[PDB]
Amino acid sequence: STQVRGYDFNRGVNYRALLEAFGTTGFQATNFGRAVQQVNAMIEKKLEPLRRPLTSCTIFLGYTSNLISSGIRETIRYLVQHNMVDVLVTTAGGVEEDLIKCLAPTYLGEFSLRGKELRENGINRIGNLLVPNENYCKFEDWLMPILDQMVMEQNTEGVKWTPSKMIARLGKEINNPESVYYWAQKNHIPVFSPALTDGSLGDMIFFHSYKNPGLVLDIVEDLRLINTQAIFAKCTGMIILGGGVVKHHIANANLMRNGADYAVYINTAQEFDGSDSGARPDEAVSWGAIRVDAQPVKVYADASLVFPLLVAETFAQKMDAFM
Template sequence: METKPEPGPSAAKEEEEQERRNLINQEFEKTRSTILVNSQPLPTDQFKVKVEGPRFDQDRSTIDLGNLLNAYEAIGFQATSLSQSIEIINKMRSWRLSDDDPTVERGSKEDESARIFLGFTSNLVSSGLREIISFLAKHNYVSVIVTTAGGIEEDLIKCLSPTYLTPDKTFGSVEGKKLRSLGLNRIGNLIVPNQNYCQFEDWILPIFDQMKLEQDQSNAKWSPSKVVERLGHEINHPDSFLYWAAKNKIPVFCPALTDGSLGDMLCFHSIKTDPNPLVIDIVADIRRINELGRSAKKAGMVILGGGVCKHQIANAMLYRNGAEYSVYVNTGQEFDGSDSGARPDEAISWGKIKGDSESVKVFADATLVFPLIVAATWAKDHWKSKPETETTEPVESKK
């Protein structure tokens, strides 16, 4: 019998190399199958929007603000969240009771709209967002406002003297010690001369005197919201959101009324009138805002920033088992358990937002995105209702 010759050194080496390659290919196929897992077919009723951005070189209309904001939905990340915020605000603005109750006639007195609660921190009133807030109050676009003491005083002070940008428009270009020696207060890249607060004191203390007199002579009861309403009437200035809120009977709540220059003025006045000072009842306001939350047919929250203004509104929503619409705009994070950084889902767990509600958090500086949100919602419809030839509105004189 003829025996098969033993493979030579070269053939044996080739066989060994082939086995090695086969082993590598087997391992590669295992790895490949792990990485390139086949996708299940996407439900077409859920996955409708393809990710894509505006094509600036293909269509001139993409530079139009409205068209650009419409494109945000498909961009992804916070652009999509911004688009959601616009959609939710438009829904809360347009809802009417007749949408849910067929027994209510469309457009009738009983056809109530959603009650919109607007909250914002004081720094936003220091910024140019103040004029946007005034626009919303002037035209009755919001139902309830919640802010902090700084939000109240900054609105009033700006009617007396302006706030300025730092000379080079940057943060901290002049050290705090130097600014203090010049009597200049810095808020980010804004400067408020301390003289503004001196003017504020001269303006507000006589008003407190009159309120104290009304308390003593006619048993007037003052809560923070009643104090703020009075200040809105007294300032009598069309740039002020407090003026418009008072004029339109929009309640402005300030749970932390004493936390700021306003608190200093109350402190000074209390010392001067001791032992019978001006009394401000904070419990009256918590009852009032909670009832506004409870009695709303539907409620929406638009909250810029965090802290007191955010939680005071959210807590009032608890009295109705949660808001139907919610938009948060802030840069807070939730890793430390802060309410300021909490996403809407956390509020759902507390019953402050309904589980089937429409809600979004936009992670952004409100000065960047709120002008865009308002432009695409309230302002868009505001001008849509006017003739195209009308490009300005009459401005109330500053009295």
């Protein structure tokens, strides 16, 4: 039986102690402390001895596209750079905006900026962030020569493209250590995104296809690829930021092994609308995506606040072991 007690600033600002005190502070601070424990359990299992080498715990990291628009892009890049996770799942924006950020920056704005004035100035709004139209022109100039080569390799070298194979290629092409997908392909970390056409990359494929028709992106082979990552794992953990396709696709892969061993959700969705996004971890227990003997954790919060704190208290403390 653990008593509720917050951090006492009469001790001064001891940041490690302040973060540890979230566990006994209550409400979502306590869930944060539980999430730290669950992620550290994943890492401790992964470091147990037994293209990418198998480890004792396969960690799936999922995130919605807007988190790549945000500075959480740097947090994810760090984990991928140091081989701390094994499989990435994101929607199409979460692919393309990592690449675009290597060509031009995203800027801070406000949620309340009016769409008319923004559109008239060629500025696209993402929450309280701003992406100029010119960023996508740069993307077009960068991407079209690659699409030309991909069609050629398909038609003359027999290549059968899927979203994950295209994402590996785009990461190699961007050739920039600030990029998540640069590090992912270098470290043989696959990236799944079954609706890769739903964004700017789709715009480009669409326009490209009228001049150079025929590109195929098969989602069936990529379903086999993600499901086998779960089926042949010794143990699995899921770390899922946000909801939607990213959350369900990781969960359903883990259903194929009768459930993940560890799971942490950070998302703002609520259960009352019946949505998969808002479903509690215990819903996933009913269908076998989380094992009955797991102790999963959900933190109800904007991941832009919580995820850097979580990484500080887990992966970043064990960096030595990942090098």
